[PDB]
Symmetry: C3
Subunit: 259 residues, 3 copies
Amino acid sequence: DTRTLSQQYLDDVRSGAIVIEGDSAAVSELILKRDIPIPYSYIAQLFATPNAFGSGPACIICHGSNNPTHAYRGLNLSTCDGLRNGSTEQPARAIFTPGEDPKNAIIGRRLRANRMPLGIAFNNPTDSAPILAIKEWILAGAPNDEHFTKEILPLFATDNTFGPDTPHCTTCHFSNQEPPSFHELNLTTYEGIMLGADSVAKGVDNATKVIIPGDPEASKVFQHLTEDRMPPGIDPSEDRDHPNTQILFAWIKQGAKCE
Amino acid sequence: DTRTLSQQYLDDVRSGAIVIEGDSAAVSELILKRDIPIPYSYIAQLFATPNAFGSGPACIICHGSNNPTHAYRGLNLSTCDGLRNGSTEQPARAIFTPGEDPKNAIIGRRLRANRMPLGIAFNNPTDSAPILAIKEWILAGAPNDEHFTKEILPLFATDNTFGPDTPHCTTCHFSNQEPPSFHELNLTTYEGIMLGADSVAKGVDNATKVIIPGDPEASKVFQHLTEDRMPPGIDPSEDRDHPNTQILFAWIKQGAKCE
Amino acid sequence: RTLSQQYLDDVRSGAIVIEGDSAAVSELILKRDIPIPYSYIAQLFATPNAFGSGPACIICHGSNNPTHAYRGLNLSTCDGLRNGSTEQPARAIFTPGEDPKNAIIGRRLRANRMPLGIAFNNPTDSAPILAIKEWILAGAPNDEHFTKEILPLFATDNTFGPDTPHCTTCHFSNQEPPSFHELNLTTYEGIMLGADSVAKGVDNATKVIIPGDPEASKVFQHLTEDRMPPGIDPSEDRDHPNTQILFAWIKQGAKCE
Ligand code: HEC
Ligand code: HEC
Ligand code: HEC
Ligand code: HEC
Ligand code: HEC
Ligand code: HEC
Ligand SMILES: [Cu+2]
């Protein structure tokens, strides 16, 4: 306001306006809430340092060029224009959009979204028959037909469908009750699937839909089935809301500026 | 005098001159004792990296500019001259002096000194009424009068004085013997407060004076009451003598050179 | 085929195998020979705990000036790395394009000083060590002098430092447990046979004594070389991913790109 950070701070401690709820309160209340500008120099350091978002190798080792024989997906995370360009190998695509919330863009999911069924190792195929079966079903408008009930619905209910020694989805997702069904997602019936997640904990018409008929690419189910969290092999129990993840998101929302 | 580092090393393992007590033996005995020059590049990396002096966000996020609307206190820790300039927002002040021991300068206190009462959260006011009373009392020459006995002395003995759900000072500071009273500081009486800390182990007057009559700014009591340890929210039990802190001090003592 | 293409082909083949937390590095970075950029390597020597607990390498090895850097060794620059130690006795710490596993840089990162746990403030030139060095120089014979004066050094407590166990505590047979690296130091034949004799053939065994040459002898190396950074705890991972990436870079030519 022409007001200094210090002044807003001193006013905020009087007010009681700052609330400390968790280990990441410094980041949450003083950095994100105050919209402090994030320098690209810090962002560069995140992609270059190991364990920057949770245990594993530095992103730039495997994604350090727009050459597809030196870097996976022709994705260059080591430069500001590279980040903005995204994957250059066909099918080429951006991994976020400057100025927009990246939480559910490709970069957001790769940092925060555990592959399903939870715990499955990255060396299991993401193009397997069951996955492609679901992809096609979603494409066909995700109908509730004979075919679905017979050939698709049991994929969520059978052990070892997407890899050896893996539990059926409905082990963890079988009701809309807060525990024991995670995210209150119920994958036992057609209706449970199209209802989506968190319908009890949030609005029933603010429920997180997991199937988007006509669109496999935007379907949380298909995304979770096909996207390995980064860096590859990162354990599921690693914090999905790492402060560096949040500082990264802030930088993107601020324009992904090379300044 | 004229020996190489290696030569002094080989001499000292023979002498028994090198002594090992803690994980930081490498640092204390081989780096600090030999005044190995610290490169600014390393120092820069310390303020730019999360957890560099203990758990928390990187300094340069909150202190990355001399613009007080982009950086707390207009303090720029991200450049060498920025470090040398210190806080630029009024009241502007240096946080250290090149060539001088920074242990008890503002930079040293912010890294090593836990705010009191120990454990208190940073969203409590540092200018509250009790703090101003104590400050006033110190300004007036810290007399042992009626006002002190009635209005100041009990501030060290009452729960929740400096914030909600905080223990009274005399919980941990009530005698001059090493356990159970921390740093042998006794705040139950006037004489104990003016005697200070560390009176048995180094003193009784090689003791750390904690009240400097006439000068609240230099008084450890007032400092510990008003200064939050950095980064904000850092847990008190985090090492106060982190090797990176010591390396930082070394760099400052060596002239704070920009290479 | 591209990296992505070799990857997707490899997951279908069953070609990728996962054994440890460090699976990503071994199978996706080392096995596909992704080029390692010097900029990353630089950051390794400049960051504390990069290869395991301890100060950043460049603090102690940050110049070719021996009053500013141990051994006049500069790890902070690419030409510095290739140069190695400049203080007499000057020597390179690796050779570009060759596996550095057993070069000086490799031993200082992976080889715990022996006997395991001995502190770095113990002399690496003590009488027992010179005795062993001399015995190796003389061709490592199995004579009277060896049996009476050398062999017992490996079976006696507090030989190489105060409160240190006899070597044969951990090295007395050729099986993975209980004898580490299948090394048997109780007999002449055991010492000359070496390590890894079961896991490799008996004629692919890793020799730990190289007669005539102490500098190249694994026994003498372990007795005299402190793992870096000084004071690093022995139980620290000897196969740190950063160590492996470093080795990859060196093998790739140690390019200043
Ligand atoms: C080598 C072990 C890698 C490390 C280190 C990182 N990633 Fe990764 N990434 C890797 C693979 C094998 C793949 C899949 C390639 C394929 O063709 O299927 C990916 C993919 C991504 C993507 C998606 C790109 C797209 O166009 O959809 C992203 C956004 C991504 N990786 C990000 C990322 C991050 C943030 C990393 C550091 C935490 C990281 N990668 C490291 C292999 C490796
Ligand atoms: C227990 C080991 C589970 C198995 C088996 C499956 N899922 Fe899962 N899922 C689980 C948890 C703990 C979470 C929360 C997110 C996290 O990583 O902790 C999830 C989340 C999902 C979601 C997203 C819900 C949302 O609100 O966005 C989806 C769409 C999902 N899971 C789908 C899914 C599928 C298709 C499964 C069979 C392959 C499956 N889950 C199994 C725990 C577990
Ligand atoms: C945001 C979460 C911050 C982080 C990261 C760091 N600091 Fe900080 N600092 C922050 C605030 C809100 C304040 C108080 C402002 C006020 O008006 O009271 C401070 C204060 C300091 C100071 C004191 C400057 C002075 O003039 O007295 C110093 C020297 C300081 N901080 C240093 C510092 C260090 C070393 C950090 C990394 C360990 C660090 N800061 C991070 C907020 C935040
Ligand atoms: C127990 C939770 C404590 C409470 C209550 C108070 N203090 Fe404390 N103090 C405590 C410890 C463990 C230490 C050592 C430093 C550290 O953080 O580990 C201290 C130190 C001080 C000092 C410094 C003495 C010195 O040698 O510099 C002072 C001046 C001090 N404490 C003052 C103080 C005040 C004013 C308190 C009530 C508001 C108070 N302490 C409470 C532990 C505890
Ligand atoms: C100070 C605590 C040091 C740290 C940090 C690192 N090293 Fe070190 N190094 C140190 C000493 C005292 C010595 C012995 C010198 C002598 O005269 O005996 C060494 C030696 C080495 C060597 C050997 C060079 C040679 O000519 O044989 C190497 C290759 C080495 N150190 C590497 C190294 C690495 C990789 C480090 C970071 C993990 C590192 N050193 C840090 C002191 C210190
Ligand atoms: C138990 C505390 C041990 C004592 C006593 C000795 N060694 Fe050791 N050794 C031990 C381990 C766990 C290992 C694995 C590698 C590592 O650095 O941790 C080793 C290895 C060796 C080797 C290397 C063989 C190879 O790499 O192929 C040698 C040559 C060796 N040890 C020799 C040795 C000597 C001379 C000892 C007495 C001074 C000694 N060892 C004692 C565990 C233990
Ligand atoms: Cu305004």
